[PDB]
Design a binder for these strands. Structure first.
Lengths: 49, 44
RNA sequence: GGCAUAGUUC
DNA sequence: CAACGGGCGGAACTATGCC
DNA sequence: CCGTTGTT
């Protein structure tokens, strides 16, 4: 059945218990932004990393 | 702009301290080490 | 601070 | 015909050893 | 792999 409206969904859905895994790759360890931060020494360009 | 005899190096330019910066314990670059060796041999 | 090596994502 | 020299992907993220 | 330069 549909969640918002309560009406049956016309097509029957394939549902059952499958074994899932949570991989190491999260988003809190990947989000990154910069606006005028630290700067390299030899080239005076922005740092790397 | 390019006279033929000038291609024989008799005066060696030394790059400024910006081209070969010091390292922060103070470390000298590969260019600085080679320059020191060259001037050692030259004065000897 | 830098050099090198290894692993991983697309 | 033989010898020599330069050329060989793009990004990104961790870790560890050493000067 | 294949553009230069030497040797022959």
């Amino acid at each position: 059945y549909n969640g918002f409206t309560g009406r049956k969904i016309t097509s029957q859905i394939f549902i059952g218990p499958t074994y899932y895994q949570r991989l190491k790759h999260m988003v809190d360890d990947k989000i990154h932004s910069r606006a005028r931060g630290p700067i390299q020494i030899l080239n005076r360009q922005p740092m790397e990393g | 702009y390019a006279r033929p005899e000038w291609m024989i190096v008799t005066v060696l330019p030394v790059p400024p301290l910006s081209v070969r910066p010091a390292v922060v314990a103070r470390n000298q670059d590969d260019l600085t080490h080679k320059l020191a060796d060259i001037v050692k041999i030259n004065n000897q």
